[PDB]
Each structure stands twice: as C-alpha cells, then as structure tokens.
Amino acid sequence: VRLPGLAAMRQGTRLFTPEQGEDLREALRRRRGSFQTTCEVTSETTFAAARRLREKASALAALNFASAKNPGGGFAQAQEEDLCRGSGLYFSLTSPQAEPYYAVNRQSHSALYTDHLIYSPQVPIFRDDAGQLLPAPVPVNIITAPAPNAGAVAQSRPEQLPQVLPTLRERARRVLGVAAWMEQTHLVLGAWGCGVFRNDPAGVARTFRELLEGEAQGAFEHVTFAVLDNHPQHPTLGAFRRELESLC
Ligand SMILES: Nc1ncnc2c1ncn2[C@@H]1O[C@H](COP(=O)(O)OP(=O)(O)OC[C@H]2O[C@H](O)[C@H](O)[C@@H]2O)[C@@H](O)[C@H]1O
C-alpha cells in the first residue's frame, strides 16, 4: 500500500526554473528584516534537526544536497541518500513536473549545472537515523538544488574553476529565495556539497553567513546548520562552527 502523504506531496511538487531568479530575489527583498533570526550549528543529521524543530516551526524547510543528473544520485554515504531512505523524498523527485531539472542538467554538460530547483512540500519523514519506524510521520518541506560539482570542475574543466564560488553564491541565494517565496520560517541548512562534490567547507559556510548577514538578513525565524561529521579530525563541522560564530 502507498504510504500516507506521498500522493499529496508528489502532486504538490513544484519546479523553479532559472527564469524565476528575480521573482525569488524580490521575495527575499520583501521578507528582509521580518524577525530576529537565531542560527545554530550542530552535529545532527539534516532530518534529526528537522524532527527537533518541527514542534516549534510554523513553516519548516530543509535543503537537499542534491544530484543534478539523476534523482537520489543513483545511490552511498551521501546526505541525499540519507533523505531518501528515510522519507518520501524520492517519490517527489521522480515526479513528472521535476523531469525538466534532471533533463536540463544533463543537457548542460557543465559541471556547474543549471539554476533549476525542486520544491517538494510536506515530505513525510518515516524513520530516524538508526532506521527505526516513527510513531507518526513528521513532514518537512525540501528544497532540492545541486551545489556546483567543484570536484568534477577541477578534474574535467578547470576553466570553470573561477566560476565555482560565484555559482555557489548565486545558487545559495535562490535557495533562500525559494524559502522566502514559500514563506518558510525555519531553515535546516548544512555543508552544501562539501563531501562528494569537494567544495571548500569554509567557503560555503561564509557564503551562507554573508547572505544571512546581508540580502537574507532577518528573513527567517530560525536557521539550523546540521553538519554531520564522522571524521575524527572534524574539519567540516569545525569549519561551520568557526565561520558561523559571529552570527551566533
Ligand atoms: N545524512 C546526512 N545528514 C546531514 N548531513 C550530512 C549527511 N551526510 C553527510 N552530511 C554532511 O554534508 C556534507 C556534504 O554531503 P554530500 O552528500 O556529499 O553533498 P555534496 O555537496 O558533496 O554533493 C552531493 C552529491 O553526492 C551524492 O551522491 C548526491 O546525490 C550528490 O550527487 C558531508 O560531507 C557531511 O558532512
């Protein structure tokens, strides 16, 4: 039997095309300065921070560290795979209205990818990190967007190297712009493409904080950076702790 909430979420899945970029900027403009934004940095999984926040959250959204080319990246240790094995996210990402995001990214033939985003609303979370069922499913909105593949740019098209950071900065701006357009109050962010995509975890942490300090200042109630780091040296998490300290 089909799981509860899957059909409503798949039916409501929506694509933001790159020609909507100024619609998303204006939504950020219009929402600037609405609250006192509290921003933590934690050790939890994206979905752990989600299930924590949901009882305080009018409008909960979390960022999927997405593959540009096939839904779920084709599945092993990555965040998007965490989200799919424990939620109905995959049923949304394979929806018909989302096909253009995967189709155009493939035709792009560029490691920086395009500026399409997938908004999946009310995605049921069914399991915790240990993998056990949940009493009741807890729903979360998911913005899906690929960070530029810094690793593939360096190994395949170094000419685009100077474009990695601008690309990541404008794309992060559209992610917050989607969240503002959908009037979301609580954002679960993280180490967007600092694992398999090889981006510099210091760079994405400061790019986030720059926008949270400028264009997106006050735009959301509560931002949670849920950076999972199992490596003993803890360099990813330590980069977001270090870089987000002034803003909290
Ligand atoms: N379950 C998790 N929950 C929260 N944070 C996590 C989790 N797993 C890892 N992190 C942290 O988030 C950081 C980045 O996790 P990554 O998934 O590599 O995102 P990307 O930007 O590199 O590219 C994702 C690609 O890899 C996949 O194949 C996708 O399909 C894409 O093709 C990790 O280093 C962790 O510190």
Author numbering: 29 to 103, 107 to 279
Task: Provide the publication's sentences verbatim.
Despite the abundance of PARP1, most of the PAR generated by DNA damage is rapidly degraded, with a half-life of less than 1 min by poly (ADP-ribose) glycohydrolase (PARG). The radio-resistant bacterium D. radiodurans encodes a PARG homolog, DrPARG, whose expression is upregulated after radiation damage, so it might play an important role in DNA repair. Our study demonstrates that DrPARG is involved in catalyzing the breakdown of endogenous PAR and DNA repair in D. radiodurans. From observing the structural peculiarities of DrPARG, we show that although previously thought to be an obligate exo-glycohydrolase, bacterial PARG could exert both exo- and endo-glycohydrolase functions.
Therefore, we attempted to obtain crystals of DrPARG in complex with ADP-ribose. Crystals were found in several similar conditions, but they belonged to different space groups. Notably, the 28 N-terminal residues of these solved structures from different space groups, including P21, P32, P3221, and P212121, were not well defined in the electron density maps, which suggests that this phenomenon did not result from crystal packing. In fact, the missing residues located in the intrinsically disordered N-terminal region of DrPARG and might be highly flexible. The structural flexibility may reflect the multiple space groups observed in X-ray crystallography because packing patterns are constantly influenced by the flexible regions during crystallization.
